[PDB]
Design a protein around this ligand. Structure first.
Ligand SMILES: NC(=O)C1=CN([C@@H]2O[C@H](COP(=O)(O)OP(=O)(O)OC[C@H]3O[C@@H](n4cnc5c(N)ncnc54)[C@H](OP(=O)(O)O)[C@@H]3O)[C@@H](O)[C@H]2O)C=CC1
Ligand SMILES: NC(=O)C1=CN([C@@H]2O[C@H](COP(=O)(O)OP(=O)(O)OC[C@H]3O[C@@H](n4cnc5c(N)ncnc54)[C@H](OP(=O)(O)O)[C@@H]3O)[C@@H](O)[C@H]2O)C=CC1
Ligand SMILES: NC(=O)C1=CN([C@@H]2O[C@H](COP(=O)(O)OP(=O)(O)OC[C@H]3O[C@@H](n4cnc5c(N)ncnc54)[C@H](OP(=O)(O)O)[C@@H]3O)[C@@H](O)[C@H]2O)C=CC1
Ligand SMILES: NC(=O)C1=CN([C@@H]2O[C@H](COP(=O)(O)OP(=O)(O)OC[C@H]3O[C@@H](n4cnc5c(N)ncnc54)[C@H](OP(=O)(O)O)[C@@H]3O)[C@@H](O)[C@H]2O)C=CC1
Lengths: 336, 336, 336, 336
């Protein structure tokens, strides 16, 4: 059974733990967490969550170097520097890197220095880091990869259906805009930030900001290299986001044919990854959905027979986290 | 001097009054208001505004059938039925219809029955109603028109630059999505509404909803008939919205050429209607801007040489209201 | 087997139904709902809720005048005029008045004229209407009462622990302030309203407003007559509120003792009604709590040995609805 | 001609500068700003503000180490270590400590080591640091104080009217609760924090937290020593807060009399510091008010002739910053 370590017990770190906790017969086993905030803080923020609600499990605090969840305990380490982490001592097989600071080979490699065997970054990698999106190119994964990236939340929402669109209609070019819930990277009130837009009060504005999803899609789907670009619009919601993709395709089509193409994948190769919703819902209704992307069938439009517009919802926190568990499961099941 | 009457003292009704108050040497003269809420309520909500801030003017309450603003008084009527209104008695020349309920010829025509000479609907008209967008087709207006529409806020933001795009590059087809601030039509908490999405808590969700701007553009710009479609995404902000337009054009171009095309119009035929912003701002920064549309130059993108994506900001309340005053001014200056 | 009818399928009406649905061996049978919005709306808003999340039950429309919940079919009617409802024809024993418009005898009386045998107003009754707060004075209820009131959510949170305070320390005089979540009665954006403060944008302000909870407590707790007063502060949160009580007691005490008095009562006389939380929690953590009041023990203070300050949380929608169910249960248990 | 340096260009630092900029014949000369974010950021965030709106002044960068405001050039430096600041070299007379990190003697002392002649902490000082509240005890300030504190926004709103209450009615004991807007110290989304409640999503909860304002009032008002206590409730509003005071007074009185006492003081001893509003207003209406406290007269209540409840509003950012300017003005006026 794969011994897992969670580096950075934040939104994704905690969502990951709770997603894993819900899996039946998991090949993973979370033995340690690195929360630079304290054992008591880890147990408290794990039990009480403003987004997921109160954790339906017995969350207690063990000694002062570990917490308890439904009985099974998990040690709690604390060190802003990976090289010191007791990964080697504990024999950590995989480190879930969710700090948002160690994304390049050197930064993430430190976990390896500490004694870890593998590292899975819960974000896009930097400079030669194999990226994988479950349902798109996960089959290209090999146990030889010591450092891997699960891409971004937007990329995991877009890639699945872009793959279907390209395969069935052939994308020529396109553009995307994601109306995204605010995240920890933004500021509560106008404050310093390298990105002068993200520096503005998050709950008060619609804030345009760059996104890497467009180019990231090209990584997991080589055929899209240089065909897409896009932006993000952060808005006053705490979780759940939506992507608006517009593409010109080679084969003429219409809205209902596109929707059917999505349903076919949803019922087959993309079951559990892509879903198609025919009800008139809103963002709050997609909270805690396990899929990576949900097409709002009713909003699909086709202009001039070859300009397709698709609207897809995604729980950037929970949905993405389920994909982290899936990739971790792959790393385990394909362990040699 | 044109005698004006404001029917429905709501967001637009009040914004209109304050916009007019700020104009220098106005050809209009607001003599009466129809607030089914009371003289005291009119004066209070006119003086104190959660969006515009406290009205910098002496707002008092006269008798009980009129209010006072910086000295000049304005009578206050109250009747949910236009046919009864004392328009004839007062000799009302133009009625600013901002109730949101009298948009067809029959409904708005009642103001005419009451004795009003003209009616200007602060919203899209229904069934054979001449619609005008200042800076696009206002020249087609004639004093013979007894009932006219100033279209919607989104239409006033989109039309101006779509006109420039079509004239300079030739639009083949396109799609639009407006991330719009919530409005009075939505619900504070999940409650009844014909639109099951707009029925959901407005400050808590991203709510997809239909928009008529796409087809409305075709009204003021015949050449666009059947070339555009789009949707709206209402989000948790009280005012200021943004439109994301994607179009395939006939002439190949690039981002900087498109921006320059917009600047040229902004400095000329569209001065005061269209503006181009080169700073990294957010929605809050566009509050109280007088223009109908402001291009976020830095976000303009061109894919595959002919797929143009443009992001434009607009103060749906204040910006639109300034356009209502402009159209009213036209009705006055062109009065025969 | 009380035949129950729900008049007004709003926040409380829907919370009521879901609360009732979760009870085991209920003496109530909800057979009809009067939803002026129609069958599709009732089914949709019952299934999807921005606060409660998606109803974990099979909810769907049944024909054109009913809906089903896990196979249980419930008739749906639509009439704003209570006198025309088919209560007598259907043999309705109890009507749950959750409209907020028929809170007086002449109004609620309309249901009796329509044939209903009794009415329970989900709010303070207006005039000489018997009001009951479960855990405080319900034993005073009599089958002879044809129209009763369950009081407000605020009164239901306050009364319970004030009963404990008065019984063990003796309240001489006091004042309270409730920091209440916004409700449908408030305005989304500055709009007409009897209360010039409730007329202001709800998600943007701290809105002071009157409250009758202080006086209402004297109806269920005769001893407190003329001893308490209070006001309310509506803040930008969708659900869950909190009461701040300051009372001068006859018996000198201290914080630890006061909390002790609350715990013993919560473990006996007020079990299931009053609770005491020793955790450093926030509003969202109290969502969907079945009790009527939860004392935040760490906030209890006592100044000069006799001035006590108590802070208690309460889910104004769900917690109160559980109480409506309980009061309805009492009506059934004492039915003659 | 006091040479002033602003350390920490945050909400208060920027509000300070804008407040100072609006004063006529100021004895202060802001010559330098230490903004760890850099020159472009300082210029940008000073010009664009989500709360104050766009600064009506020509703001722009000047070279690579300064900015200008209407032609007035201000040097900008960037160092997180106060000891390395060029205070002595520049001849800085007074440092405005708005970082929130150097509030103790050893910390603020670092500025003195760097050559500054005096430090004014924009917050409660930690330890034996003289604290002053303009309108309450400023006359006690002496040029000999090298490090002083202007107290918190809450203490500045409370002290003024509590001085009036104590002087005309005699306060025996009391308790207060402040419904405060969120601040940068809180978390955007559930994240690490010393205070497990402040760690919770700020725009989503009512967050209780400790306050030292009650005790701080005793520092500027010796008479109230050990007579008051209190707590704070952080709510989802960006700016403007309100204090709820409940005191037991020695002199029996009534609401109208208490308000009368406040008005006479606001017209004399506390003019420009304390104000009384007789309008039914909401938080947003008190934005950018220069006074430190505004009593909401219609909310004043008196229970049992001696229990008084007072509610006062205060712009925690702007109102308090005007006070920092005034205290700075005093430092200049008493300079030796
Ligand atoms: N939130 C979401 O929906 C998505 C986020 N992501 C990405 O995942 C990453 C994390 O996001 P999110 O979970 O929202 O953020 P969080 O702030 O919740 O989590 C980051 C965690 O890392 C900790 N940390 C920071 N520095 C270090 C360090 N040097 N060493 C060890 N631990 C450290 C932080 O502690 P502390 O705050 O105290 O410094 C925090 O606990 C980011 O790259 C984000 O872009 C990807 C998909 C979705
Ligand atoms: N808000 C904005 O940014 C934009 C809105 N518009 C459009 O303008 C219209 C008004 O919008 P908005 O100003 O936001 O809404 P408001 O609710 O602020 O204004 C509508 C006003 O009409 C009054 N009213 C309702 N029915 C009647 C009636 N039967 N007779 C007389 N008066 C009546 C309302 O009173 P009461 O509420 O008490 O019934 C209210 O005062 C809508 O069509 C909207 O789509 C167009 C562009 C922009
Ligand atoms: N909100 C809460 O936390 C609590 C509220 N209550 C009480 O319950 C009542 C409802 O409150 P709340 O649910 O918050 O308010 P809402 O405004 O959300 O609900 C009122 C409902 O009544 C419907 N309605 C209006 N008129 C009629 C009518 N004539 N006949 C039948 N149905 C009608 C409304 O439909 P439509 O909007 O389409 O007109 C709406 O669905 C009030 O008495 C309130 O004091 C009690 C405890 C708690
Ligand atoms: N907010 C309000 O209403 C009031 C606050 N105050 C007090 O003023 C202070 C600041 O509060 P507030 O503005 O709200 O907080 P913010 O967090 O908004 O501002 C703090 C600022 O200090 C900067 N900073 C951090 N460390 C240093 C350093 N070592 N040297 C120089 N600058 C630094 C920060 O930059 P960075 O974030 O990049 O690290 C940030 O710009 C606190 O003492 C607070 O109690 C007083 C009255 C009112």
């Amino acid at each position: 059974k794969l011994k897992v370590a969670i580096n950075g017990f934040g939104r994704i770190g905690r969502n990951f733990l709770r997603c894993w906790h819900g899996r039946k017969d998991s090949p993973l086993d979370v033995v340690v967490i690195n929360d630079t905030g304290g054992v008591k803080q880890a147990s408290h923020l794990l039990k009480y969550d403003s987004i997921l609600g109160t954790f339906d499990a017995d969350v207690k605090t063990a000694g002062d170097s570990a917490i308890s969840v439904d009985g099974k305990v998990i040690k709690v380490v604390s060190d802003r520097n990976p090289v010191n982490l007791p990964w080697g001592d504990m024999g950590i097989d995989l480190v879930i890197e969710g700090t948002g600071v160690f994304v390049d080979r050197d930064g993430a490699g430190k976990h390896l220095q500490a004694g870890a065997k593998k590292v899975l970054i819960t974000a896009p990698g930097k400079g030669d880091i194999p990226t994988y999106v479950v349902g798109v190119n996960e089959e290209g994964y090999t146990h030889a990869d010591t450092i891997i990236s699960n891409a971004s939340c937007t990329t995991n929402c877009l890639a699945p259906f872009v793959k279907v669109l390209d395969q069935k209609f052939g994308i020529i070019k396109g553009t995307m805009t994601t109306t995204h819930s605010y995240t920890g990277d933004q500021r509560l009130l106008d404050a310093s930030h390298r990105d002068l837009r993200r520096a503005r009060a998050a709950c008060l504005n619609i804030v345009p900001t760059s996104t890497g999803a467009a180019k990231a899609v090209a990584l997991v789907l080589p055929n899209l290299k240089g065909k897409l670009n896009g932006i993000a619009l952060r808005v006053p919601t705490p979780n759940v986001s939506v992507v608006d993709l517009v593409v010109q395709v080679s084969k003429k089509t219409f809205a209902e044919e596109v929707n059917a193409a999505f349903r076919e994948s949803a019922d087959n190769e993309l079951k559990g990854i892509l879903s198609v919703c025919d009800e008139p819902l809103v963002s709050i209704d997609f909270r805690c959905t396990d899929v990576s992307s949900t097409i709002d069938s009713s909003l699909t439009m086709v202009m001039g027979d070859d300009m397709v517009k698709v609207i897809a919802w995604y729980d950037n926190e929970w949905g993405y986290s389920q994909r982290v568990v899936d990739l971790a499961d792959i790393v385990a099941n394909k362990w040699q």
